[PDB]
Design an enzyme around this catalytic site. Structure first.
Site, short mmCIF file in Angstrom:
data_model
loop_
_atom_site.label_atom_id
_atom_site.label_comp_id
_atom_site.label_asym_id
_atom_site.label_seq_id
_atom_site.Cartn_x
_atom_site.Cartn_y
_atom_site.Cartn_z
N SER A 25 7.85 7.71 -1.24
CA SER A 25 8.75 6.62 -1.54
C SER A 25 8.05 5.26 -1.69
O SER A 25 8.72 4.31 -2.09
CB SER A 25 9.86 6.46 -0.51
OG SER A 25 10.90 7.38 -0.68
N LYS A 43 7.23 -1.30 2.20
CA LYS A 43 7.97 -0.13 1.73
C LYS A 43 7.31 1.11 2.32
O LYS A 43 6.11 1.33 2.15
CB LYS A 43 7.99 0.00 0.22
CG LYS A 43 8.76 1.22 -0.30
CD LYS A 43 10.24 1.12 -0.11
CE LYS A 43 11.00 2.42 -0.28
NZ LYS A 43 10.95 3.27 0.95
N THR A 44 8.09 1.96 3.00
CA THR A 44 7.62 3.18 3.60
C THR A 44 7.73 4.36 2.67
O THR A 44 8.42 4.31 1.63
CB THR A 44 8.49 3.48 4.84
OG1 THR A 44 9.87 3.50 4.42
CG2 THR A 44 8.34 2.46 5.93
N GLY A 45 7.05 5.45 3.03
CA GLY A 45 7.32 6.73 2.38
C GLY A 45 7.10 7.84 3.42
O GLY A 45 6.23 7.72 4.29
#
Length: 266
Positions: free
Chosen positions: A47, A211-213
């Protein structure tokens, strides 16, 4: 830089504590001081690609910002897992801007797919990356298949070095116009999903845009920019992925890597 050399050693030691790979870049944007581990190796971005997607949307809107207010009346049939905003609002639809905020702040997968489709497909996100100087990023698939994180697969990957350069250009530099850069920063500053990752590894007076994933093979990532008070921004790129297909994704390795770099810069 002796602080950089010590941090790189500590990142190697951190990687030795788990059966997987750590990809890391931290870049002090004033001095160019740069801490890297496996910087030129490919990692599944998961993501974290949503940042590139939303930058492409903002870029597409620059000549007509009202395009962000366009209502998208999506269908129940579009809804997939990990879509906490789009599933709530399917009756009314959502604007493009609201889809970007959902994708970035809640990691809404349906919202990402709707935006990818509005742009013309995943190839348009790769094309956007190329236009801002990133020859490495590649978006091959849509959600959720881009999260397979398969060993040796180059689909839906980038390198920490390439992503560091792109985050720098987008949030701090001039890849975007001033209004678009500000909007991307505002969205990422307000992310809801990263409290245990980069945000957990920085001093209390630093602001973070991230922003994480999270994907298969215990893949756990976080990218963004830290904003300490009274000094220039610091880019942080953290990719991790594990060898066991049954691995459980973690937050603590990202927070530990972040703390290593924060000590180097203070």
């Amino acid at each position: 830089m002796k602080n950089v050399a010590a941090a790189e050693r500590q990142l190697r030691e951190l990687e030795s504590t788990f059966d997987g790979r750590l990809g890391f870049v931290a870049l002090d944007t004033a001095t160019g001081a740069r801490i890297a581990h496996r910087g030129d190796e490919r990692f599944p971005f998961c993501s974290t690609s949503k940042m590139m997607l939303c930058a492409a949307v903002l870029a597409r809107s620059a000549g007509e910002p009202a395009l962000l207010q366009r209502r998208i009346a999506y269908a129940k049939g579009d809804l997939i897992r990990y879509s906490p905003i789009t599933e709530q609002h399917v009756g009314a639809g959502m604007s493009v801007a609201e889809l970007c905020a959902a994708t970035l702040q809640y990691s809404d997968n349906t919202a990402a797919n709707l935006l990818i489709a509005l742009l013309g497909g995943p190839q348009t996100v790769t094309a956007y990356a190329r236009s801002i100087g990133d020859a490495t990023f590649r978006l091959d698939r849509r959600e959720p298949e881009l999260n397979t994180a398969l060993p040796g697969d180059e689909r839906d990957t980038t390198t920490p070095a390439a992503m560091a350069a792109s985050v720098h250009r987008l949030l701090v530099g001039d890849a975007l116009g001033a209004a678009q850069r500000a909007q991307l920063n505002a969205w990422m500053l307000g992310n809801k999903t990263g409290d245990a990752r980069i945000r957990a590894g920085v001093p209390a007076d630093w602001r973070v845009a991230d922003k994480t994933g999270t994907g298969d093979y215990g893949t756990a990532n976080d990218i963004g920019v830290a904003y300490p008070p009274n000094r220039a921004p610091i880019v942080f790129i953290v990719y991790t992925t594990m060898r066991n297909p049954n691995a459980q994704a973690r937050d603590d390795v990202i927070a530990s890597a972040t703390r290593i770099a924060a000590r180097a810069f203070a």
